[PDB]
Design a protein around this ligand. Structure first.
Ligand SMILES: O=C(O)c1ccc(C(=O)OCCO)cc1
Length: 263
């Protein structure tokens, strides 16, 4: 009968483009990070059922600030989101992946901790990964190594190998047209093209620098719509979001759009 994971009101373009989703969001600092540097957990206070968890990792030299906007944006639509700082700002993608997954493990821990604000708020069987640049590469390594993850949505990803043919997790790649750090033609697009087994999508922002999907970007309506739609469709199996997840948004800000195996 009903989808047990469906949360919130039926979506519209306006409701997904808005700065905030329907749920009230609170946050806390992780007291003793388990296998990573630091974290902030964002959660809905009024979701009305358990929700999936998403761990988000920054790029080389970067901190939570670069990725923080995703925390309230996703949590307000019905997700527990952990943004992390890595053990070193100079960690590489394999270490970033390990830390991302340690952060998901700690969110699953806190779901069982009676003192935690997220006590009983998480469905530990439904998880996703996001991250910027080397943290985006780390997200793809997380997905390759943990195929029970339900979704991945890295931004401006880089890894030393572009071969993610092993990934079976639904994966949305945000790319930045004018990226001079991890050029689209040598990084994000080859990564996208390597993936053969999954639902996948590629969304490149016109004129974007390497930071085009970071906190303070000028395309939060489109990027936030797509990220939330992808996570709802695939983490919650929520087919109310099938068209938002799969469509070409046919937007003036999009300079390359590709999708395959989307439903
Ligand atoms: O995480 C990053 O921001 C980061 C991403 C990519 C690189 C790198 O040198 O790629 C070489 C291809 O241009 C370095 C740092």
């Amino acid at each position: 009968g009903a989808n047990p994971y469906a949360r919130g009101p039926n979506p519209t373009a306006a409701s997904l483009e808005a700065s905030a989703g329907p749920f009230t969001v609170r946050s806390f600092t992780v007291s003793r990070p388990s296998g990573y540097g630091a974290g902030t957990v964002y959660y809905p206070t009024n979701a009305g059922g358990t929700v999936g968890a998403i761990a988000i990792v920054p790029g080389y030299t970067a901190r939570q600030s670069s990725i923080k906007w995703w925390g309230p944006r996703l949590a307000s639509h019905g997700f527990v989101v952990i943004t992390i700082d890595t053990n070193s700002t100079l960690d590489q993608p394999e270490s970033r992946s390990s830390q991302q997954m340690a952060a998901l493990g700690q969110v699953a821990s806190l779901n069982g901790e009676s003192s935690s604000p997220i006590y009983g708020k998480v469905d530990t069987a439904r998880m996703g990964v996001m991250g910027w640049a080397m943290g985006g590469g780390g997200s793809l390594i997380s997905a390759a190594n943990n195929p029970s993850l339900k979704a991945a949505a890295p931004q401006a990803p880089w890894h030393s190998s572009t071969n993610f043919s092993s990934v079976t997790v639904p994966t949305l790649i945000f790319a930045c047209e004018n990226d001079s750090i991890a050029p689209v033609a040598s990084s994000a697009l080859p990564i996208y093209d390597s993936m053969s087994q999954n639902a996948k999508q590629f969304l490149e922002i016109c004129g974007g620098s390497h930071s085009c999907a970071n906190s303070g970007n000028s395309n939060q309506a489109l990027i936030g719509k797509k990220g939330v739609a992808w996570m709802k469709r695939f983490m919650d199996n929520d087919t109310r979001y099938s068209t938002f997840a799969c469509e070409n948004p046919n937007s003036t800000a999009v300079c390359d759009f590709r999708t395959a195996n989307c439903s």
